Point group: C3
Chain length 183, copies 3
Amino acid sequence: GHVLQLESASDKAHYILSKDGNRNNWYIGRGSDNNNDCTFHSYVHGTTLTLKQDYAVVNKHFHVGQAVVATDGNIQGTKWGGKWLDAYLRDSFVAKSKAWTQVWSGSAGGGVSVTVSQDLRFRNIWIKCANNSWNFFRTGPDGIYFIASDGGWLRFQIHSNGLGFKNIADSRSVPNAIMVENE
Amino acid sequence: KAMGHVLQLESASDKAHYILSKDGNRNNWYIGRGSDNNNDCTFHSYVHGTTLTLKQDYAVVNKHFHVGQAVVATDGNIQGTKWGGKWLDAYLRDSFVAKSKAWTQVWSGSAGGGVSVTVSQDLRFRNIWIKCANNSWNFFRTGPDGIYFIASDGGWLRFQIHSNGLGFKNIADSRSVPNAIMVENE
Amino acid sequence: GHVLQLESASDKAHYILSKDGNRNNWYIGRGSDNNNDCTFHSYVHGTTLTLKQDYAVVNKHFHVGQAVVATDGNIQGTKWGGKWLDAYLRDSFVAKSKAWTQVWSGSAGGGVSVTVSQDLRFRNIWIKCANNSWNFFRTGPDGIYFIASDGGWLRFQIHSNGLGFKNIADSRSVPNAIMVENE
C-alpha cells in the first residue's frame, strides 16, 4: 500500500501540472491559494471539472456514454428516441395550453363540406351552431360523429386527414364556427 | 527522439495506491485508488467533502452536479434555461395535462334559469362534469369565459363560464337544472 | 504554493499511471500523443472520465448522489418517485397518442351490462349507437353518465373498476361499439 505525498504550507495551492513543449496542457489539484476547490482542467481544450463546496461542476456539455446533458438543462439520448427531451415531451404529451384558435367560420348547411386550417383528428374542438353557444367535442380519426348541438343536433364528418369538416345532416343546428384547443 | 512520458507509480494491485495533497498537515485532496481490496478510483476533496468516483458499472459524484449553470440534483431533478429557468418537475407540471385520474367537486347547489354561482376553481379549459336531472354526470370540456351548451340529462342546459372561470351561470335550461360540478384534478 | 511539474515534448502524451507489474490499475492525464484529451481512467473497471474539446464525458451511467443519468438519456431519482423519468412521464401526463382502440362491440340494450378490454375510468371514449356515428364522452370514475347520443340518448354506467359498461336506459340509441383513446 502506497501514497505519493504532496505537501504545501497551510492554505497554499498544490497541484500537478503537465506542460507539453512550452504549453501548459492540463493540471489536477488545488489550483489557487486560500481556496479549496480541486480542479481537473484541460488548458488546451478549456474543459474543466471542479469539486466545489456544495457541488461538482463541468464547464461544458456533459456526455454519459453517448447521451448528452446540455448546459441549458436539455437531455438527449436513445430513450427519448434520439430527440432532445424538450422535443420528446412536446411530441409525447398533451399540451396544457389553455388557449384556443378558430380553424373555420362561415356557414355549413346539410351536405356542405369545408376546409379547416388544422388537422382536427384527436383534437378538442368547439362548434358554434344556434343560439351563440359553444358545443364541445373531442374528435378521433377521420370519421362520422354526432353532437346534440344547440338548436337540435349535428351529424358531422371529419375527412381528408383531418382537414375537411362536413355537415352530413343537422336539425336546426348549422355550424358557423369551429375552435380548436392549441397544441 | 521524443517519447510519450509516464510517471509510473508501482504498488500492490490489491492495496490502496493514490496521490495525497496536504496543506499545513491537513488532508486536502487525493486522486487514485483510495482503499485496499477495492478498485474504485477517486478524485476527492477532504475539505469540501466533494467527490468523483469511478466504480465498476458507473461513475458517481456525491453532491449536485452542474453542467455549465444547469444543475442535475441528487434527487434526479434538473434545472436549466431550456426549462425556462425552472426545475424540470415544475416545467412538466406547467406544460402538460396531468393524468390524475381523479376529480373534485367544486360546487353543489341548484342553479335554475338566470342563476349564477361562484365555484372554487378556475373552470376555464377544464374537464368538467355537470349533474342535472336523473343523478347522472354530463361531461363537458370548457374553453375560456363564454357561453356553452350541453344537451344534459333532462333536456338541455345553456351555461356561461364568467369571471375568469370563477363564475358559473345557468343561462337557460329545459328540465335540466345543474346541482353539482366536478372538475378533473390538475 | 507548490506544483509537481510534468514535462514532455510538444504533442507527446504525459500521464501518471498506477500499476502492479503488467497489471495497470488507473491513470490520470494526457494519455495519447497528438491528442489533448485529458483522462481519469480505471483500467480495472474500464470506467472513465474524459475532458474533450467541446464536452466532458463519462463512458458509463453517471450517478448524482443516488440519482442516475443513464447512457440512454433516462434519469432516475426520488423526485420522480424513485421511477425512471420515462415511466414517471408516462404515468403523470396524458399521452398525445392520436390513436384509438376498440374495447367492445356487440349490442347493449336497456339494462344490459358488458365487460370491456380496458379500465374505462378517466378515459376518452366514443360510443357508437344509431346512424353509424361516434358520440364522444370523457368518463370520470365508476359512476352514472348521460349522453344525448345519435338516435336519442343513453344513460350508462361505468362499473367494476372501469371494466363494466352498462346501458341503464336509452331512447332509440343502443350502444354497439366503444372506442378508447390510447394511453
